[PDB]
Design an enzyme around this catalytic site. Sequence first.
Site, mmCIF file in Angstrom:
data_model
loop_
_atom_site.group_PDB
_atom_site.id
_atom_site.type_symbol
_atom_site.label_atom_id
_atom_site.label_comp_id
_atom_site.label_asym_id
_atom_site.label_seq_id
_atom_site.Cartn_x
_atom_site.Cartn_y
_atom_site.Cartn_z
ATOM 1 N N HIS A 46 1.033 -3.385 1.368
ATOM 2 C CA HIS A 46 1.678 -2.585 2.406
ATOM 3 C C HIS A 46 2.408 -3.444 3.459
ATOM 4 O O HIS A 46 3.093 -2.875 4.306
ATOM 5 C CB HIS A 46 0.763 -1.544 3.043
ATOM 6 C CG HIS A 46 -0.261 -2.097 3.977
ATOM 7 N ND1 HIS A 46 -1.607 -2.028 3.679
ATOM 8 C CD2 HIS A 46 -0.111 -2.639 5.205
ATOM 9 C CE1 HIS A 46 -2.229 -2.570 4.713
ATOM 10 N NE2 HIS A 46 -1.370 -2.957 5.651
ATOM 11 N N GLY A 66 -2.769 -5.031 12.716
ATOM 12 C CA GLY A 66 -2.409 -6.431 12.529
ATOM 13 C C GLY A 66 -3.532 -7.231 11.893
ATOM 14 O O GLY A 66 -3.293 -8.357 11.449
ATOM 15 N N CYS A 85 -4.985 -6.506 9.063
ATOM 16 C CA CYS A 85 -4.807 -6.401 7.623
ATOM 17 C C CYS A 85 -4.621 -7.748 6.979
ATOM 18 O O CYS A 85 -4.012 -8.630 7.575
ATOM 19 C CB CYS A 85 -3.663 -5.454 7.307
ATOM 20 S SG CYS A 85 -4.095 -3.720 7.550
HETATM 21 C C1 LIG Z 1 -3.341 -3.184 8.988
HETATM 22 O O1 LIG Z 1 -3.638 -4.036 9.799
HETATM 23 C C2 LIG Z 1 -3.568 -1.781 9.131
HETATM 24 C C3 LIG Z 1 -3.207 -0.875 8.135
HETATM 25 C C4 LIG Z 1 -3.352 0.545 8.135
HETATM 26 C C5 LIG Z 1 -2.843 1.386 7.167
HETATM 27 C C6 LIG Z 1 -3.066 2.753 7.423
HETATM 28 C C7 LIG Z 1 -3.763 2.961 8.599
HETATM 29 N N1 LIG Z 1 -4.144 4.153 9.143
HETATM 30 C C8 LIG Z 1 -4.645 4.268 10.524
HETATM 31 C C9 LIG Z 1 -5.460 5.531 10.671
HETATM 32 O O2 LIG Z 1 -4.718 6.689 10.246
HETATM 33 C C10 LIG Z 1 -4.326 6.572 8.873
HETATM 34 C C11 LIG Z 1 -3.457 5.355 8.646
HETATM 35 S S1 LIG Z 1 -4.141 1.454 9.386
HETATM 36 N N2 LIG Z 1 -4.147 -1.364 10.341
HETATM 37 C C12 LIG Z 1 -5.486 -1.413 10.619
HETATM 38 O O3 LIG Z 1 -6.322 -1.840 9.831
HETATM 39 C C13 LIG Z 1 -5.888 -0.845 11.914
HETATM 40 C C14 LIG Z 1 -5.180 -0.119 12.854
HETATM 41 C C15 LIG Z 1 -5.983 0.233 13.952
HETATM 42 C C16 LIG Z 1 -7.248 -0.222 13.844
HETATM 43 S S2 LIG Z 1 -7.502 -1.096 12.406
#
Ligand SMILES: *C(=O)/C(=C/c1ccc(N2CCOCC2)s1)NC(=O)c1cccs1
EC number: 3.4.19.12
Lengths: 304, 304
Positions: A41, A143, A145
Site C-alpha cells: 500500500h 506512518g 506501516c
Molecule cells: C500505515 O502506517 C497505516 C496504514 C493504514 C491502512 C488503513 C488504515 N485504516 C485506518 C482505520 O480505518 C481504516 C483504514 S491505517 N496506518 C496505520 O497503521 C495507522 C494509522 C493510525 C494509527 S495506526
Amino acid sequence: SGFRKMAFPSGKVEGCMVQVTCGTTTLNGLWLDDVVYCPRHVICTSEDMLNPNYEDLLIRKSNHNFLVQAGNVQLRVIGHSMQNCVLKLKVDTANPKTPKYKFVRIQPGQTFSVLACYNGSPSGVYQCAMRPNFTIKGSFLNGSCGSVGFNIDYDCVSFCYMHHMELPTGVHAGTDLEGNFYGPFVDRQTAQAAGTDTTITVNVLAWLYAAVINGDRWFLNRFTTTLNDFNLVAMKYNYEPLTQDHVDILGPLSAQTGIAVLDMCASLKELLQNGMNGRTILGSALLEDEFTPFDVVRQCSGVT
Amino acid sequence: SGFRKMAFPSGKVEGCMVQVTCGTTTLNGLWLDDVVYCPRHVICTSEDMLNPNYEDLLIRKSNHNFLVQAGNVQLRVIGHSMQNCVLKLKVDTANPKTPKYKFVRIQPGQTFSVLACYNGSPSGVYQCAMRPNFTIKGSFLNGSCGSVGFNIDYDCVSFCYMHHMELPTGVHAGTDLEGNFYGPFVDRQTAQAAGTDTTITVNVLAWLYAAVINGDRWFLNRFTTTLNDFNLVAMKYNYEPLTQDHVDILGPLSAQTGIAVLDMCASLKELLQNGMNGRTILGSALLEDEFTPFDVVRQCSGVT
Ligand SMILES: *C(=O)/C(=C/c1ccc(N2CCOCC2)s1)NC(=O)c1cccs1
Ligand SMILES: *C(=O)/C(=C/c1ccc(N2CCOCC2)s1)NC(=O)c1cccs1
C-alpha cells in the site's frame, strides 16, 4: 526476581530499518541482503486505499518511483516485485548490517517484539502477541506501516510480522514477511471487524508459574481439575481451550515449581470464578496472557 | 492507536555492553570511550559481600585482575579507579560504537529503559520507573549487575541507572553512572528495607490523558476538584502529592484533549474512591504510573 514485559534487544533490527517513499506516501521498509520489504500500500494514495487494484496501480510504477533511504543515504532500486501484500524492492547494495535471519509465520498466542518506526527511524520497542482473532494490540500511529515484529534466538532474528493497518476498532493487522495477512484482513480501507479476542490460556498459566517462581503465591489453592472440567470453565470466560500439547509445553515450569499443570488450572479456574478481590499477581490486577511458556523460561533463566 | 509500555530502541546501548570479571565474580560493564564502568562489588566474593571494605579489597587488585571482554575479544586494562560505588576501568581502546552520551541523575517518578544483560550480552529490554522510595521494580537475575537504565533524546543516550542489587524483598537498587546510589541503599548484604512505594500521581494522570487520546473515556466524570482537595484524597490512597509544577507539566496533554488538569484529577479521585468495578483502562485493571507526561506525548506523537 521481578517479571517484566520484556522485548528482545532491538539493535539487530534497527540496523535493517529504512524509509520507503512512493509518490506522496512514506512508510518503513526492512532491508535484508539486497532486498527492501515494505507494505504494497506504499503505492496507494488515501483515495486509492478505498478500493485498490494493486496489480493495476503497480503498472504505473517503475524502479525510480520507489525512493529508499537508509540513514540519510539513498539506495538504488534495480528491481521491484509484489509478493502477496508486500513489495520487494531489489537494491544495488546488500545491507552491511544484515543479521542472520529467517521469515516465520507465527500462530495465535505467540509473542514477539515490535520495533515501532517512523520515516525509517526507530521510535520504540515493545512486546505483544498474535491474538486468537489474528489482530495485535500494538501502538502504531500513521506512518508506522512497515514496522516489524520479530523474535531472536541467540544471533538469528526470526521476522514474523510487518505492520499494514489499523482496523476501524483501533486494533492492528499485518502480514508475515511473505506478505500474507494474519487472519482474514485485507489491505483495503473497508469494513473489517475482528472476531472474539479470547484469552490465551496456556500463556496465563505460564505467567501464573512465573508468579510462583517470583514469590507471588496467594492464588495457589488446595484443588485440582481435569482438562475437560477446566475447559468447560475456560469456554465460559472466553479463554482458549487448553490441550494436552499445552500441558506438555508447560512441563518445564511444572517441574521447576513442583505444581502439576492441572493443579495450576484449578487455581486459574478459581481466579476466574472468584475474581482477584482487589489483589494483584506480579503487579497486575488482571490475568496476563502475553507471555508464552518459552518467554517465562527465558526470562526466569536469563537467556542472552 | 494503542498504548504500550514501550522501551527506547536498545541498539546504541547494546554496542556498549561488555563482560567484567574479577577473580570468580563476573558481571556487566558499560564501555564508553576508553572507560568501562561497572559495580565495585565485582571485587567481592559472596563472603566479602556481608561486610565489605571496598578500599581495602581494592588494594589487593591490579589492572590485570580485571578481565574485560567485548564480544569475545579481550580489552587491555591500563588503569582502574573507584568513584563512589562504581569502578572505572581505563582500557587501551576507545569503544568504536560509543554513542553521544550524558550521565544523568534522575528523580523519582522518572522512567527509563533497562537493557538486562548477562555475561556482557543483552537478554532483553523493558521500561521501568524510579519509584518514590528510590527502588526500581525490574527483572534481574544474579549476574545482571552492571546492566544499565537509559533514556534517548534523538541520538544522545542519557545513562541514568546501573544495577547493583536486589533487596531481600525482591525489589531493585542501583546507582547513577557517578556511582551514587539512588535512595539510602548500600552495596552490602545487610538489612535494607524499602520505604512506602507510593503511586506517581502525575504519571497516572498522564496515562489517563493517553487513555482519552486512545478512546478509553468511560472514567471521565462530570466533576472537578482543587489541588488541595485532590491531595487530601491522594494522601489517603498512598499517591504522591500533585504540585502546580505537575499541573504545568500536564499542560500539553490538557490542551490536546481539552480536559482541564483539575477535571482529570476529579476523575482520578472518583476512580480511587469507587474502584474500577471490573472495568479496564488501556487494557489495565489498575491505574498505571510508569508513563511520564513526556512518554505519553512521545508515544502519542511518534518521536524517533
Ligand atoms: C500505515 O502506517 C497505516 C496504514 C493504514 C491502512 C488503513 C488504515 N485504516 C485506518 C482505520 O480505518 C481504516 C483504514 S491505517 N496506518 C496505520 O497503521 C495507522 C494509522 C493510525 C494509527 S495506526
Ligand atoms: C548482581 O548481579 C547482584 C548483586 C547483589 C548484591 C546483593 C544482593 N542481595 C540479594 C538479596 O539479599 C541481599 C543481597 S544481589 N545480584 C542481583 O542483582 C540479583 C540476584 C538475584 C536476583 S537479582
